[PDB]
Structures are given as C-alpha cells and as structure tokens.
Design a protein around this ligand. Structure first.
Ligand SMILES: *[C@@H]1O[C@H](CO[C@@H]2O[C@@H](C)[C@@H](O)[C@@H](O)[C@@H]2O)[C@@H](O[C@@H]2O[C@H](CO)[C@@H](O)[C@H](O)[C@H]2NC(C)=O)[C@H](O)[C@H]1NC(C)=O
Ligand SMILES: *[C@@H]1O[C@H](CO)[C@@H](O[C@@H]2O[C@H](CO)[C@@H](O)[C@H](O)[C@H]2NC(C)=O)[C@H](O)[C@H]1NC(C)=O
Ligand SMILES: *[C@@H]1O[C@H](CO)[C@@H](O[C@@H]2O[C@H](CO)[C@@H](O)[C@H](O)[C@H]2NC(C)=O)[C@H](O)[C@H]1NC(C)=O
Ligand SMILES: *[C@@H]1O[C@H](CO)[C@@H](O[C@@H]2O[C@H](CO)[C@@H](O)[C@H](O)[C@H]2NC(C)=O)[C@H](O)[C@H]1NC(C)=O
Ligand code: NAG
Ligand code: NAG
Ligand code: NAG
Ligand code: NAG
Ligand code: NAG
Ligand code: NAG
Lengths: 65, 410, 94, 98, 49
C-alpha cells in the first residue's frame, strides 16, 4: 500500500483519506484489532487476501463488581 | 533535644500535591534537497558530490520521531484492560467527580484535564502526527484511575479484585505505620480533608505548567532559526538561487552556488545535532515518568520523597499536552505534644521492652503508645516482652506491669 | 583575554556548609521525622534501636550492647579521617 | 550446603564507608566577536554574513550555566529550616565532633 | 568558527553527564539521609542504618 503524507487525495496523479494523508491500495474495515503496522492518528495497517486499514483498539473492556 | 524527652503527634492532615512531567516532543522531518536547493537541478548535481550527507540526516530525524511514540506508549500503556467505574458511586465520603470523566466535556476529559489543556498554548519542513490521539490517552488514564479506585493495587499484579474503598484506605494506613481503628474512627474528617484538598488544587490551577511550555518554546525557536538561516549570503552575491541562475553562465554560477550549499548544509547539521541532544533529555524524563506510574500509582511507595512529601498514600494520573500530571495524596502529622520516655521498665527484677510501641509518661503514670499517633494504653504482659535483668540497660525505670490472668484466677 | 569569562556560582561555599550542617543536626536530633513534617525530638539511643528494628534485629540487642556499638562507630570515624589524610579522583577529573 | 544445616551469626560489626559524587561544573562564557575577530571592524563585517551563528552559541552556553545552579539547588536545598544542635551533647557514647 | 562549534558541542554532552550524576546525588540525599533504605547496595554494603 502507498501512503502520500499530508496531501489531499484530489492532488494525486481503494483511496482512503486519513489525517496522516492519502492511503491507496488498502481497504477500510469497521472492525478493530491491535496495531501491527502503525500509521498516524490512531490508524494501523495489517495483512489478512489484501492489506487493510482500521482503528486500533486499546484493549478489552470489563467492569469491576 | 534531651536524653529523656520525646514528642508525639496527636492529629493528622491529608495533603494533595501536583507534579508535572514532560513525556514527548513534536515530530518533524526535513527534506535536504528541497531546503538546500529547491527546484534547481544544477544545485542538485552540485549537491551529489557531497555524497551520503542527507541520508544520515534523514535517518537521525526518523529515529527521533519513532522514539517519541515509544516514549508515550511506555508511559501510558500499562493496563491490560479498560476498566470502568460503576454507575453507583459510594466510596465512603470521598468525592472523585473532578478527576473522573464526564461525557459533556470534549474528548470525554475530566474537569482538571480540561483546565490543563487550555493553559499550555514550505522549505521541506513537515510535522508528523502522533500515533496515539488525545482521546486514546484519556481512555488509558480513565482506565488506570477507575481500576485504582475500584480494586486498589491488585490489578497491577494480576486480575483485579474488588474491595470497599474505606477498607483499602485502612490497608494503606497500615502501610504507613498507623492502625486501622485510627481510620475507622475518623472517617468523615479524612473524607472532608481530601475533598477540600482537591478543591484547592482545582482553584490553584485555574488562576504552573512551565516545564511543558519550555519544550514547545525551544522547538519553535529551533525551527525559526532554521528557516531564518536561508536569508544569509555566506559570501555569494545574493541569497536567492533563482537570481544566481539568471544573470550568470554556469562556470561562473557554480562557485557561488557552492558557497550557498556549504552554508546551508552546515546549518542543517547544527540543527540535527541539537535535536538529538534534546531528544536524549526528553527520553530520560519519560523514563522517570514511567517509573513513577508503576511505583506510585499501581502501588504504595516506601521510598522517601519519591511520590511526595509526607507519607505516601496513593496517586492519581492525569494527561496534559505532551506530558503527565500526578496528584499525590500524603499523610502529615500535626499538633505534637511533649512527654518523658524510657528504654525499658524494671519490674520484679526483669526488663520489659515494648512490642511495636514507645513508653511515655504524663508526669505521674506510664503508658505505652504507638509511635506515629497518641493512643496511650496500660502496660501489660501483652504489650511487652521480657529480656534479662535490670542491671545492663542505661535509663531503666521502675514501674508495675499488670498481669491479666491473675484477676481471673482470684 | 580572548573573550573567555568565568561566572561565579550563586551559592557560596559558606551557604552550602550551612545547608549541610542543618541537615546533619536535624538528623542527629530528630531522626527521620523532619523530612516528613515538623521535627520531633527523640533520644539518640532510642532512634538507633528503631533502626535496628528496621533491619530485622530486636531492640534489646542494641540496649544490651550499647557501649560496644558506640566504640565501634567512633573507631570507624577515626579510620575514615586517617584514610582521607594520606580518593577524590572523580572530582578531579571534571 | 546441606538439606538440614544452617549458619547463624553470633556478633556484628559497625562499618562506615564514603561515597563521592560530582554535582556541578564551572560556568564559562565566550564572546564570538572578540574571539574570532578581536577589535577588527573588517572582520566583523565579514562575520555578519554568516548570520545567527553566534546567538545560538551564546544561548547554549547560558543554558548550561543556569543548569549548573539548578543542579546545586536540587541537591543541597532540601531543608525548610536551619536546625541547630544543642550546646549539651549527650548522644549516648557516640562522638560526632569530627 | 569551526573550533568554537566543536567546543560548544562537547560542553553540551559533558553537561548532560553531570546532570545525570547530580540527579543520582539528589536521590541519595532524599532516600539515604532523610530516611532508612531497604534497597540493596544503594546506600552501602551491609544493612543500612
Ligand atoms: C496522667 O494520666 C492519668 C491517667 O489518665 C488516663 O490517661 C490519660 C492519658 C487520659 O486518657 C485520661 O482520660 C485517662 O483517664 C491521670 O490520672 C487520672 O486523673 C483523673 C483526673 O484527676 C482521675 O479522674 C482518674 O481517676 C485518674 N486515673 C487514675 C488511674 O488514677 C493523671 O491525672 C494524669 N496526670 C497529669 C499530670 O495530667
Ligand atoms: C484534628 O484536626 C482537625 C482539622 O482541623 C480538627 O477538626 C476541626 O475541628 C474544629 C473544632 O472542632 C472545627 O471547627 C473544624 O471544622 C474541624 N475541621 C474538620 C475538617 O473537620 C480536629 O478537631 C482535630 N482533632 C483534635 C483532637 O483536636
Ligand atoms: C527500683 O527498685 C529497686 C528495688 O526496689 C531499687 O534498687 C535499690 O536501690 C537502693 C538505692 O540505694 C539500694 O540501696 C537497694 O539495695 C536496691 N535494691 C533493693 C532491693 O532495694 C532501685 O533503686 C529503684 N530505682 C529507682 C530509680 O528508684
Ligand atoms: C563481638 O565482637 C567485639 C568486637 O571485637 C568483641 O569485643 C572485643 O572483645 C575483646 C575480648 O573481650 C576485647 O579485647 C576487645 O577490646 C573488644 N572490642 C571492643 C570494640 O569492645 C566482643 O567480645 C564480641 N562478642 C563475643 C560474644 O565474642
Ligand atoms: C480535499 O478537498 C476537498 C475539496 O476539494 C475538501 O472538501 C476536503 O476537506 C479536502 N481534504 C483535506 C484533508 O483538506
Ligand atoms: C461500516 O460502518 C458504516 C457506517 O455505519 C456503514 O455504512 C457500513 O455499512 C459498515 N460496513 C460494514 C461492513 O459493516
Ligand atoms: C462532589 O463534588 C461536586 C463538585 O463540587 C458536587 O457537585 C457534588 O455534590 C459532590 N458530591 C457528590 C456525591 O457528587
Ligand atoms: C517541649 O518543651 C520545650 C521546652 O523548652 C519547648 O521548647 C517545646 O516547644 C515543647 N514541644 C512542643 C511540641 O510543644
Ligand atoms: C540524662 O542526662 C542526665 C544529665 O543531664 C543524667 O543525669 C542522666 O543519667 C541521663 N539519663 C540517661 C538515661 O542517660
Ligand atoms: C570526641 O572525639 C574528640 C576527637 O577525637 C575527642 O577530643 C573527644 O574527647 C571525644 N569525646 C567528646 C565527648 O568530645
């Protein structure tokens, strides 16, 4: 996947816009996992087939009784 | 000072203190060819002859940039799970509403976090965004604080185990050397003192964050010097490449382009070196912050003045722009009194020494008390142990020791 | 004479000596209570017995052997004084 | 080592040890124009074209100089008040005169 | 000018080293002098008094 850092996706020669920049070649998914490959602003990337992009999850959620 | 005089405190005070610690700095990158040359191809060809100077600069800046993210992750990411506080809030009389999150505020930050955030305010230079957004750091902080107030220190060692708040505070008083009944008998007084201390902290902030501001000022000043350095001639006819490229043929232009290249390259090297040194300093500060998070927040510390002045009880973390704030609760003795004291007591040709206590006299009677609080009690064989005879000890005194069994037999 | 100047430090040596004497007098008269709050007096032998409790030995062990411990401490201080006047390389290197 | 054998000490020794720690260094400042040029005005005019090189050097040296004072204050200034020892010195048999 | 830059850089590095040593000294003052330390070999060999 290719990340153009800081440029709007309009100003370029599976196009997903992040606060880091324009990411081309990766598919956005609603699910969240651990990071693996890090991109800025809470977006990570991983391989599982095509490369995907998601928001990282801090951890499991439980309530103490 | 006297050889038979002691001073024992008869009351206490709960004090809350704040500590500020920088954790990370801004992440910047610089493109050598754009800064030194711009869009000139002649300048680029002349630059190629100083081979491998820019790759090292880019490697240095990238290393600093990744180190910043490692710093932040080391400090805040110390919880396995995201614990939550129960909807019903009965923690004795203690009121944690100020430090707890509230949904109305932006990013679901606490009141004090919002007060903290307001206080701190084209040549190839780029600024990269950090990996963890502010909302994620706030979620980490809330998980740590909720785990603390609901389970105590057990969530650091393993799975979280619930315990009522007053019982946990009694455990901590045992930790500093005072008994549990001292807490249970004075619970409302302690709760009121803690609430007033939190109120004073909130008022004090909204009226202290110089350590965090200095980092921002230094970074901005370094960038401003770097950009301003482009205006210098360094000995050439002018500081603009587009003017030198015109008005001159290549053989005459190459020497002045060389002078400009040398000056700008030296400026870049100076900038990168000072950035490396500043990054090392910030790394040391971040390591200190991570150690404080482990030892003051997840546990109770016996180290002197590490967490704060007095006797440490517990700590609460908060997040601030590029840094962390620690609220330390401590126990301070007050209202002391004078007594006379003795090492041992000679009764029936024996020497009696205290078990975890000190002998005191109000001028007529002898009692045994705990060291950090005045709770006098009668001297019996349950309070004391026997060792030898009265000859050896210097300062032994004569008294009587009540034997509880004898009245029962009679 | 080429623009090189040496600036004097803010705290003179007498002020540092006063700080050190205050720390040491507070230690020998109040123990560890002056760090936590107001200083509280306690006889020296009783404080040393508290410290033996701190390392895991009982109090009667101190009270029964007080003169021996005092003599050992005095001899150790004497040996330190003799050793110095005969070690400060870390300060000299700077 | 054996599976039912132990060794218990029957006496003790009081030992005093010394530790040395550096705290601060000397504070120096350098004037660029005097060092590089002296009293030459031609040298000064030629130096102006390498703009802003000396201000950074002076800032660096000043920062080091103030950091030294912060070091000393952090180490020694840890007492609220200046306590004094009583004229009568009865500390058991311990002798702190040295 | 090159000589001056070299001098200033080495001074910055030495100052960082001295700062680390001063922080160690301040921690020792707090934990060994104002208190009694249970950390092994921090204050000295043996059991600290
Ligand atoms: C010294 O204390 C004794 C004992 O008083 C007890 O301990 C005190 C610390 C405090 O907790 C008191 O409330 C306790 O009762 C005093 O002796 C008592 O004095 C009162 C008043 O005259 C009398 O009613 C009691 O019967 C006395 N108790 C006994 C066992 O005789 C004594 O007066 C105190 N001395 C001084 C100088 O204040
Ligand atoms: C210990 O200190 C507390 C704090 O000052 C005392 O509680 C105060 O008592 C006075 C007089 O009764 C009241 O006017 C204050 O409102 C109390 N403050 C709080 C926070 O409750 C307490 O009386 C002291 N203990 C003793 C034995 O004197
Ligand atoms: C504590 O009690 C013992 C025994 O009751 C006292 O020891 C006596 O001291 C007197 C003082 O001259 C001697 O004449 C006696 O021979 C000692 N023994 C006995 C059995 O009386 C001791 O003095 C008392 N301590 C204080 C401080 O009065
Ligand atoms: C424990 O060690 C001390 C120190 O050596 C012993 O005290 C010495 O005893 C000898 C013989 O009585 C004397 O000659 C020395 O002058 C003593 N030194 C001091 C400093 O007092 C002590 O005897 C030892 N304890 C036992 C039970 O043997
Ligand atoms: C990109 O441009 C579009 C319109 O051309 C604008 O709506 C959008 O906000 C821009 N994105 C960024 C990140 O500036
Ligand atoms: C992901 O969420 C968006 C926003 O609600 C929704 O439109 C989309 O259908 C979702 N996709 C999947 C695969 O659930
Ligand atoms: C806690 O403090 C807040 C803010 O001062 C106050 O409004 C509230 O009544 C207090 N008590 C509880 C139980 O929230
Ligand atoms: C104890 O008595 C002495 C007598 O001079 C006095 O100075 C001191 O203040 C008293 N201590 C307290 C805690 O009141
Ligand atoms: C305390 O000192 C006095 C002299 O001022 C002396 O008479 C007394 O015996 C001493 N007490 C002890 C326990 O050493
Ligand atoms: C303490 O040591 C000094 C120096 O060795 C000595 O002169 C003095 O007699 C000793 N005793 C006292 C009580 O000062």
């Amino acid at each position: 996947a290719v990340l153009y850092q800081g440029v709007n996706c309009t100003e370029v020669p599976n196009v997903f816009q992040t606060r880091a920049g324009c990411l081309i070649g990766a598919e956005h998914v609603n699910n969240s996992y651990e990071c693996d490959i890090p991109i800025g602003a809470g977006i990570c990337a991983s391989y599982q087939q095509s490369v995907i992009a998601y928001t990282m999850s801090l951890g499991a959620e439980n309530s103490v009784a | 000072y006297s050889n038979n005089s002691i001073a024992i405190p008869t009351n206490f005070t709960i004090s809350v203190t704040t500590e500020i610690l920088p954790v990370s700095m801004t992440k910047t990158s610089v493109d050598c060819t754009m800064y030194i040359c711009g869009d000139s191809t002649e300048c680029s060809n002349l630059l190629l002859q100083y081979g491998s100077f820019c790759t090292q600069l880019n490697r240095a800046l990238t290393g600093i940039a990744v180190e910043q993210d490692k710093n932040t992750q080391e400090v805040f990411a110390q919880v396995k799970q995201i614990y939550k506080t129960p909807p019903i809030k009965d923690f004795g009389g203690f009121n944690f509403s100020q430090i707890l999150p509230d949904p109305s505020k932006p990013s679901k930050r606490s009141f004090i976090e919002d007060l903290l955030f307001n206080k701190v305010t084209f040549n190839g230079l780029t600024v990269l965004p950090p990996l963890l957004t502010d909302e994620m750091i706030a979620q980490y902080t809330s998980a740590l604080l909720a785990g603390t107030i609901t389970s105590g220190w057990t969530f650091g060692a393993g799975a979280a185990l619930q315990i009522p708040f007053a019982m946990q505070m009694a455990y901590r008083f045992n930790g500093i050397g005072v008994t549990q009944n001292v807490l249970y008998e004075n619970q409302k007084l302690i709760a009121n003192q803690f609430n007033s201390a939190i109120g004073k902290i909130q008022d004090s902030l909204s009226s202290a964050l110089g350590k965090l501001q200095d980092v921002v000022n230094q970074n901005a000043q370094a960038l401003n010097t770097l950009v301003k350095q482009l205006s210098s001639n360094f000995g050439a006819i002018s500081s603009v490449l587009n003017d030198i490229l015109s008005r001159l043929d290549p053989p005459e232009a190459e020497v002045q382009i060389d002078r400009l290249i040398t000056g700008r390259l030296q400026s870049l090297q100076t900038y990168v070196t000072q950035q490396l040194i500043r990054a090392a300093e910030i790394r040391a500060s971040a390591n200190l912050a991570a150690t404080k998070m482990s030892e003051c927040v997840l546990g109770q510390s016996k180290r002197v003045d590490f967490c704060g002045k007095g006797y440490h009880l517990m700590s609460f973390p908060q997040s601030a722009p590029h840094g962390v704030v620690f609220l330390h609760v401590t126990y301070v003795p007050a209202q002391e009194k004078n007594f006379t004291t003795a090492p041992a007591i000679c009764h029936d040709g024996k020497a009696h020494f205290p078990r975890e206590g000190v002998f005191v006299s109000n001028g007529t009677h002898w009692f045994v008390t705990q060291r950090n609080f005045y709770e006098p009690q009668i001297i019996t064989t349950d309070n004391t142990f026997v060792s030898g005879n009265c000859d050896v000890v210097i300062g032994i005194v004569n008294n009587t020791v009540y034997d509880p069994l004898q009245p029962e037999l009679d």
